[PDB]
C-alpha cells in the first residue's frame, strides 16, 4: 500500500516549558515544548511576543536552559524520546533567525531497561556536566567541556534501583546529586558526589535520611539556603546537613503535588501545582545569624487549569502549561478577591487534546466538512468545533467520551462522565449533566466508603446551533456507558441513539452484565424504546446493513430490529480476543483487541452467519483501527506508530494479513474517522482524519505507485538539503519503533517533509530537483505544481 500522512492541526498540549535568556542576553524568553514543536516567545509587559517556532524530529522529553562559563546567552539542551540529545544556540542576523546545533548525539544504551519512573534529566548549576536517568541502575553523565561536540557520555552504577526523583544541589564545590529512592525499608533521601576525573560516585555531603512513605518530589534550594526540599502527600520537609525542618499542612492533603517552580532567584518562594488544579505558594522564612532557614508555610493561592507544568515569568505573571486543558497566563495579586482567590486568568491558549472521540458533520449544508471533537478531561472537558483553522469551544466541565450526530433531530448525542464524592453521593462542581434544560434518570428494574470518588455516566443531547444541553439522561449506579451509535434499524423509519453499557463492580474483574438501550429524542424529550440485557460488556457497536452489530466480551452478535421493537439475535461469532475495535465496510467486519490482534470476518447473508476471512495476531498494544478500503486496514500501534496491513491461491497464505506499511507518527492516535475539511469536488484517493492525545489532527490518504515513487524520491532528495534542528535523521525519526525493535519506514510518505519543499529557496529547489524524472526530466516549476496539488487536500 502507498499512503500519505500530513498534519492538519499541530500538537497543542504543552508537555514542557522553561524560562530564561535564550534569544538575547537582556530579553526574557519563554520556551514551550508541546510534543515536537519548540515555541520561543519573548516575555513583554503586554504579554508574549512569539519570536520563533521550530519542528523537531523527535518527542521532546527533556528541555533545560543553561549558561556555561564564557557563553553570552543561554544554550538549550534537548533530549528526545528516541534518546537524541542536542545542545542548541539561538543565532540571529537581521530579520533572519535560525537555530545553531552546538552539539548533538544519541545517548541510548544497547542493553538495559527503561525506568518505570521515566526519563529524568538535570544540569549541574555550575554546568560541569549533564545528568540523565534513563535505565534502572545506571546514571549517565555527559561532560560539558567544549570538546564534547559528540556528547560522549559514561554510565555509573546506581546501587539503588528504584530512584524516584533526583536533583543537583546548589552551594556544592563538588557536583552533588540528591535523590529519593524506595526499598522494602521505605523511602530514603541519599546524596552522592560525581567525579568526572575518576568517573564515579563518592559519598555525599550529608547522610541518608528516611522521609515520608509517598515522598516523591525533590527541590534543590539555591543559596543561601542550599539543601533540598522533599515533598510528598502529607508533609513538606527540608534537609540541609544538620538543619532539618518539616511541616504537615492540611491544605495539601487532598491531592498530590506534581509540579513546582521557583519564583525568586534566591529561593524564598515557590509555586506548587496539585493534580486537580489547585495552585499553592510555598514560602521559606529566612533568619540571619550565616543565613539559615527559619520556617516553612503553604498558602493556597487559587485554582488554575490542571497544570502539567508552571513557570513564573515576572511581575506576578505565571504561565500554566496543561495537557488536559487550555494553557493559561494568569496574574498573581497581593490580596484575594471576594472569593478568596489570588489568581486571575489573563490569557488562554487553545488545547484540543486529548481528542478521545470525534465526528465529521456538514452542519451548514455547504460541502465543507466540520470536525466535532471531545477534548479534555475532568473539569477541563469540552467540545470543539473545527473548520477551515478555526476552533470553537463549548465547555462541559466533565469528561466527554463518545459523540455522534443525528440529522433527523439536529442534535449531538454525547456520552459523558462526572466524578462525585460519597457523602448518597455529592458533586464537586456544576457541569453539563446537572445544568441541562431537562433531565432523567435510568429507572430499569434489571440487576463503598466515605469520601471516595464515583463515576456517574450520562447521555447528553446537545443542540447543534447554540450547543445548549437539551437533555441529560443519567444511567444506573455503577454503570459504565461504553459505546454510542445513531442509526436506523430494520424497516422502522425512526432514528435512535443506541447506548451499550456494562455493570462494573470493584469486587469483580470482568463485567458479566451489560445493556443495550435504545433512546428516541422526540419533541424535546428522550425516551427508552427498548432495553436488552446481555451477559457481558458491550465494548463497541456499529450499524450493519440495517442491523446492529455489537461486541459483548469475547463475542460478536448480530441483532435485528423486530416489529415489536425489540432486539432479536441473528448470529453469534466467538473469538479468542475481546472485540474492542469493531469496524464495518460493505459486508466485511474488522475485529481488533488491545493486543494488536486483528481479525477479518465476512457476512454470508444467505447462510446468515460469520466466518473468518483473514487473521493477523502479533503482540503489541493497539490503540485504534480503521478500514482504508476492502483490502487495506490502518491501525495505531505502541510507541506512536502507524501500521497498514493488507489482505498465493493457498488457503493458509490467503488467510494471513501481511503488514505492508510501517511508520512512526510520534503521536498516540485515539480515533480514526472518514472525512475531510476541504470543499468536496484526484491524485489521492480517500481521506481519514485521526485525532491523538496531544491534540494533533492528522490526515491519511492513499497514493498511486507513480506518485508514491515520485514523492519517495523527493523525500530522499530533501533529506539531503533540509538542515534538521539537532541534526536528527528524518529516516531515523520515522523508523517504526518498538521495544528493542526498529525497522525503516515503509509504505508511507511524510507529507510534512514534502510540503516543506515550498519553504526552501529556489537555489535549494534546483539542488533538489536535479536529474529527477517526471518520462521527461522534472523541473522545479513542475514539482511546485505537484506539491501545491498535494497541499490542497487539507
Amino acid at each position: 500500500s502507498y499512503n500519505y500522512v500530513v498534519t492538519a492541526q499541530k500538537p497543542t498540549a504543552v508537555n514542557g516549558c522553561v524560562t530564561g535568556h535564550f534569544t538575547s542576553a537582556e530579553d526574557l524568553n519563554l520556551l514551550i515544548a508541546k510534543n515536537t514543536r519548540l515555541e520561543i516567545y519573548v516575555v513583554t509587559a503586554e504579554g508574549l511576543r512569539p519570536v520563533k517556532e521550530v519542528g523537531m524530529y523527535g518527542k521532546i522529553a527533556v528541555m533545560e536552559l543553561f549558561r556555561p562559563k564564557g557563553e553570552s546567552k543561554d544554550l538549550l539542551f534537548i533530549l528526545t524520546a528516541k534518546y537524541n540529545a542536542c545542545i542548541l544556540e539561538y543565532k540571529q542576523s537581521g530579520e533572519s533567525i535560525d537555530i545553531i546545533t552546538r552539539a548533538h548525539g544519541n545517548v541510548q544504551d544497547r542493553i538495559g531497561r527503561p525506568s518505570e519512573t521515566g526519563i529524568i534529566g538535570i544540569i549541574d548549576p555550575e554546568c560541569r556536566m549533564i545528568g540523565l536517568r534513563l535505565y534502572d541502575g545506571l546514571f549517565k553523565v555527559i561532560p560539558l567541556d567544549r570538546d564534547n561536540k559528540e556528547l560522549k557520555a559514561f554510565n555509573i552504577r546506581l546501587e539503588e534501583l528504584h530512584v524516584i526523583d533526583v536533583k543537583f544541589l546548589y552551594g556544592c564545590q563538588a557536583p552533588t546529586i540528591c535523590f529519593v529512592y524506595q526499598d522494602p525499608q521505605g523511602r530514603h533521601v541519599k546524596t552522592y558526589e560525581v567525579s568526572l576525573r575518576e568517573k564515579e560516585f563518592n559519598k555525599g555531603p550529608w547522610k541518608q535520611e528516611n522521609v515520608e512513605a509517598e515522598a516523591s518530589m525533590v527541590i534543590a534550594v539555591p543559596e543561601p539556603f542550599g539543601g533540598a526540599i522533599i515533598i510528598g502527600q502529607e508533609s513538606i520537609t527540608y534537609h540541609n546537613g544538620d538543619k532539618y525542618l518539616a511541616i504537615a499542612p492540611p491544605i495539601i492533603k487532598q491531592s498530590t503535588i506534581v509540579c513546582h517552580n521557583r519564583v525568586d532567584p534566591n529561593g524564598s518562594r515557590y509555586l506548587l501545582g496539585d493534580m486537580e488544579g489547585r495552585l499553592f505558594m510555598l514560602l521559606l522564612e529566612k533568619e540571619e545569624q550565616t543565613v539559615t532557614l527559619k520556617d516553612l508555610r503553604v498558602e493556597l493561592l487559587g485554582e488554575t487549569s490542571i497544570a502539567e507544568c508552571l513557570t513564573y515569568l515576572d511581575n506576578g505573571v505565571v504561565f500554566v502549561g496543561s495537557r488536559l486543558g487550555d494553557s493559561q497566563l494568569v496574574k498573581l495579586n497581593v490580596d484575594s478577591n471576594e472569593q478568596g482567590s489570588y489568581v486571575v486568568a489573563m490569557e488562554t491558549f487553545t488545547n484540543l487534546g486529548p481528542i478521545v472521540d470525534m465526528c465529521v458533520v456538514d452542519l451548514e449544508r455547504q460541502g465543507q466538512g466540520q470536525l466535532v471533537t471531545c477534548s479534555g478531561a475532568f473539569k477541563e472537558g469540552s467540545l470543539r468545533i473545527i473548520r477551515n483553522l478555526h476552533i470553537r469551544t463549548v465547555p462541559l466541565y466533565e469528561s466527554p467520551r463518545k459523540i455522534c450526530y443525528q440529522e433527523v433531530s439536529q442534535c449531538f448525542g454525547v456520552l459523558s462522565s462526572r466524578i462525585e464524592v460519597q457523602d448518597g453521593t455529592t458533586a464537586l462542581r456544576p457541569s453539563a449533566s446537572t445544568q441541562a434544560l431537562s433531565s432523567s434518570v435510568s429507572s430499569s428494574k434489571l440487576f463503598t466508603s466515605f469520601g471516595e470518588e464515583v463515576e456517574v455516566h450520562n447521555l447528553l443531547i446537545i443542540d447543534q446551533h447554540t450547543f445548549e444541553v437539551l437533555h441529560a439522561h443519567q444511567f444506573l449506579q455503577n454503570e459504565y456507558a461504553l459505546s454510542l451509535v445513531s442509526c436506523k434499524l430494520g424497516k422502522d423509519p425512526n432514528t435512535y441513539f443506541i447506548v451499550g453499557t456494562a455493570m462494573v463492580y470493584p469486587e469483580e474483574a470482568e463485567p458479566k452484565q451489560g445493556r443495550i438501550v435504545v433512546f428516541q429524542y422526540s419533541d424535546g424529550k428522550l425516551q427508552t424504546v427498548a432495553e436488552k440485557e446481555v451477559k457481558g460488556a458491550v465494548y463497541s457497536m456499529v450499524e450493519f446493513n440495517g442491523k446492529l452489530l455489537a461486541s459483548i466480551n469475547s463475542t460478536v452478535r448480530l441483532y435485528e430490529w423486530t416489529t415489536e421493537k425489540e432486539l432479536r439475535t441473528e448470529c453469534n461469532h466467538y473469538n479468542n480476543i475481546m472485540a474492542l475495535y469493531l469496524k464495518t465496510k460493505g459486508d466485511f467486519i474488522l475485529v481488533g483487541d488491545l493486543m494488536r490482534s486483528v481479525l477479518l470476518l465476512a457476512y454470508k447473508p444467505m447462510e446468515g452467519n460469520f466466518e473468518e476471512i483473514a487473521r493477523d495476531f502479533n503482540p503489541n498494544w493497539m490503540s485504534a483501527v480503521e478500514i482504508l478500503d476492502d483490502d487495506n486496514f490502518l491501525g495505531a500501534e505502541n510507541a506512536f506508530n502507524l501500521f497498514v496491513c493488507q489482505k498465493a491461491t493457498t488457503d493458509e497464505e490467503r488467510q494471513h494479513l501481511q503488514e505492508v506499511g510501517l511508520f512512526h507518527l510520534g503521536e498516540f492516535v485515539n480515533v480514526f474517522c472518514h472525512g475531510s475539511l476541504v470543499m468536496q469536488n484526484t491524485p489521492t484517493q480517500g481521506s481519514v482524519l485521526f485525532g491523538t492525545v496531544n491534540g494533533m489532527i492528522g490526515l491519511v490518504t492513499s497514493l498511486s505507485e507513480s506518485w508514491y515513487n515520485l514523492l519517495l524520491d523527493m523525500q530522499n532528495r530533501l533529506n539531503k538539503v533540509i538542515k534538521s534542528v539537532g541534526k536528527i535523521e528524518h529516516s531515523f525519526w520515522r523508523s517504526f519503533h518498538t521495544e528493542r525493535k526498529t525497522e525503516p519506514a515503509t509504505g508511507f510518505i511524510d507529507g510534512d517533509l514534502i510540503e516543506s519543499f515550498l519553504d526552501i529557496s529556489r537555489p535549494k529547489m534546483q539542488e533538489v530537483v536535479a536529474n529527477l524524472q517526471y518520462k521527461r526530466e522534472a523541473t522545479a516549476d513542475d514539482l511546485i505544481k505537484v506539491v501545491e496539488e498535494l497541499t490542497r487536500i487539507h
Binding site: 514542557g16 519512573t117 524506595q182 506534581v258 478521545v356 461504553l482 488491545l594 485515539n670 492525545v693
Partner: protein
C-alpha cells in the same frame, strides 16, 4: 494439614543420588533456525521451565545422549497434536549411566527452555529424526500506560507494597492516564500482568486451600504446565507467544473446567477440580518416570471416586518419598487411572492421596 517436604518430589530422588550435574544455561537467538535431535518415544507436550526425567535404553538414544553431553546438552520434544507443528527444547541438567539388570541405561533429568515451530524433520540413517526448527521469542510488552503516561505524575509510578483496598488504589493510580485514551481503567486492568497474576493466584488458592514465581513469564508457564487440561488446550497455550495473552487464556480455561472423568468411559466421574492439591512445590501436576522409562503426568488429588485398588502397596521407586502406591483403575471398565498413595508412618500428612495419570482422564 500438610507436613510432607514439598521439595522432595522435585528432586526425583527415585532415579538415584550421586548424579552428575551441570551448570550454564545454553540459549539460542530467539528468531533463528537450528537443527536439534528429536527424542523418539517422548509422547508428551513439554512446556518451558518444566522438568522431564528419562531412562533411555535404546542404543540410538543412548548414543545420542552420550554425544549430547559432549556438545549442546539440548534436544527437542515435539508437541504432537494427533503431525508436529510446535515443540520445546529440553536441556539436560542431570545425567548418569548405569549397567543395571543386564543393559546400559542412561538416566537424564532435563528442563524445558525454549519453544519453536517445526520447519522440517529428517529421519537420519540411525532411525532418528533431526528437526530443523525456528526459535520463537517471548514477546514481552511494556505497560499499557507507558505510551500515554503523563510526565508530571511519572513520579507516582512507584507504589509502597504490603489488601483489596490496596488493589483498588493500585488500579486508580496506575491507570490514571487511562482518562486520556478511549477506554476505562477496569478495561486496562484486564491486560495488566500484575492483576492477572494476582487473580490467578487467588483463583488457585480457592481450590488448593494450602497454596508460584513473580515474573509474569515464569508464572504463566508454571500455570500452563500444572493445569488439569487436555492436549489441545495445552498446545493452544504453548503457541501463544505473550505472557499477558497466556495469562488471560489460562484464567479463562481455569474458570471453564469443572470435572475429570475416565477416558474410556466418559460418564464415570473420577474427580472434580476442588480435590486438586499441590503436594510438590512445582505444582499440582508433574512428570515422573516409572522403572521402565514411561513418563506419566501425575496429578495429585485428595479424593477420587469409582477407582478400584489393585495389588499390594509398594514403596518401590515411589515418586513421593514416604508413600506407597496401589494400582488404581476404573471400576466400570477396569482401565488404569493412577495410583493411590498412602503414608508409611504415623504423624505424617496427608495420610492418603491419589496420583492420577493425565492420559487416563478427560476434562468435562
Amino acid at each position: 494439614i500438610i507436613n510432607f517436604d514439598t521439595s522432595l518430589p522435585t528432586s526425583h530422588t527415585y532415579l538415584g543420588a550421586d548424579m552428575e550435574e551441570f551448570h550454564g544455561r545454553t540459549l539460542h537467538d530467539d528468531d533463528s533456525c537450528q537443527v536439534i535431535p528429536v527424542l523418539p518415544q517422548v509422547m508428551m507436550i513439554l512446556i518451558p521451565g518444566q522438568t522431564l526425567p528419562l531412562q533411555l535404553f535404546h542404543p540410538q538414544e543412548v548414543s545420542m545422549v552420550r554425544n549430547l553431553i559432549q556438545k549442546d546438552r539440548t534436544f527437542a520434544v515435539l508437541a504432537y497434536s494427533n503431525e508436529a507443528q510446535f515443540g520445546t527444547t529440553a536441556e539436560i541438567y542431570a545425567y548418569r549411566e548405569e549397567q543395571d539388570f543386564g543393559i546400559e541405561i542412561v538416566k537424564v533429568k532435563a528442563i524445558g527452555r525454549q519453544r519453536f515451530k517445526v520447519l522440517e524433520l529428517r529421519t537420519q540413517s540411525d532411525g532418528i529424526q533431526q528437526a530443523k526448527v525456528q526459535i520463537l521469542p517471548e514477546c514481552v510488552l511494556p505497560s499499557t500506560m507507558s505510551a500515554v503516561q503523563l510526565e508530571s505524575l511519572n513520579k507516582c509510578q512507584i507504589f509502597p507494597s504490603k489488601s483489596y483496598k490496596w488493589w483498588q488504589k493500585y488500579q486508580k493510580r496506575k491507570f490514571h492516564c487511562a482518562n486520556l485514551t478511549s477506554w476505562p481503567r477496569w478495561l486496562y486492568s484486564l491486560y495488566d500482568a500484575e492483576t492477572l497474576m494476582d487473580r490467578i493466584k487467588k483463583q488457585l488458592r480457592e481450590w488448593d486451600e494450602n497454596l508460584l514465581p513473580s515474573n509474569p513469564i515464569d508464572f504463566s508457564y508454571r500455570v500452563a504446565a500444572c493445569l488439569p487440561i487436555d492436549d489441545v488446550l495445552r498446545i493452544q497455550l504453548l503457541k501463544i507467544g505473550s505472557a499477558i495473552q497466556r495469562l488471560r487464556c489460562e484464567l479463562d480455561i481455569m474458570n471453564k473446567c469443572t470435572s475429570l472423568c475416565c477416558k474410556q468411559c466418559q460418564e464415570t466421574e473420577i474427580t472434580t477440580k476442588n480435590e486438586i492439591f499441590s503436594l510438590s512445590l512445582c505444582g499440582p501436576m508433574a512428570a515422573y518416570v516409572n522403572p521402565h522409562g514411561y513418563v506419566h503426568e501425575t496429578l495429585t488429588v485428595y479424593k477420587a471416586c469409582n477407582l478400584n485398588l489393585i495389588g499390594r502397596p509398594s514403596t518401590e521407586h515411589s515418586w513421593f518419598p514416604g508413600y506407597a502406591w496401589t494400582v488404581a483403575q476404573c471400576k466400570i471398565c477396569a482401565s488404569h487411572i493412577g495410583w493411590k498413595f498412602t503414608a508409611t508412618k504415623k504423624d505424617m500428612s496427608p495420610q492418603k492421596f491419589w496420583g492420577l495419570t493425565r492420559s487416563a482422564l478427560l476434562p468435562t
